[PDB]
Write a protein that binds this ligand. Sequence first.
Ligand code: A1IAQ
Ligand code: NA
Length: 165
Amino acid sequence: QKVTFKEETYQLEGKALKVGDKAPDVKLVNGDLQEVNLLKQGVRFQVVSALPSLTGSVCLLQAKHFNEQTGKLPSVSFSVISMDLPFSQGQIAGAEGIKDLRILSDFRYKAFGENYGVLLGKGSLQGLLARSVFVLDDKGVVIYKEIVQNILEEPNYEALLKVLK
Ligand SMILES: *c1nc(C)n(CCO)c1N
Ligand code: NA
């Protein structure tokens, strides 16, 4: 699978993950510099959205709304991952008026990038995460997987919402 950024084309680094595969539980760092496991204990629908950069991203703007709608749904969690440090993530998020959003950094181990196969290879965005969304069940099996072909574009909104019906 190839991802594009203006005149650049990326080979995705890490292990390829398919619908039906058990996604591995990975270590990430939260806004309190606490190490957390990606997979929430018991939650039936786990949305995991990965961004190259939180800074001025479309996902950050709609994060507060989507987090509300998912929160009210039964057993649906919403996690946003980037290579951004937690401090920057906390201030970016805080500045947009997004409270209690599970924004997590992959900076320490690059465990999400490597295990979900979305670590961008050689190029200007090398070592950043490809724009991607996963839905995992309580068991960590991949219900839905989308990796955007154009890193600047957003995942299919329709297709994501339909999975949460
Ligand atoms: C970030 N990434 C995704 C897929 N979302 C949900 C739609 O806005 C956000 N907020
Ligand atoms: Na999608």
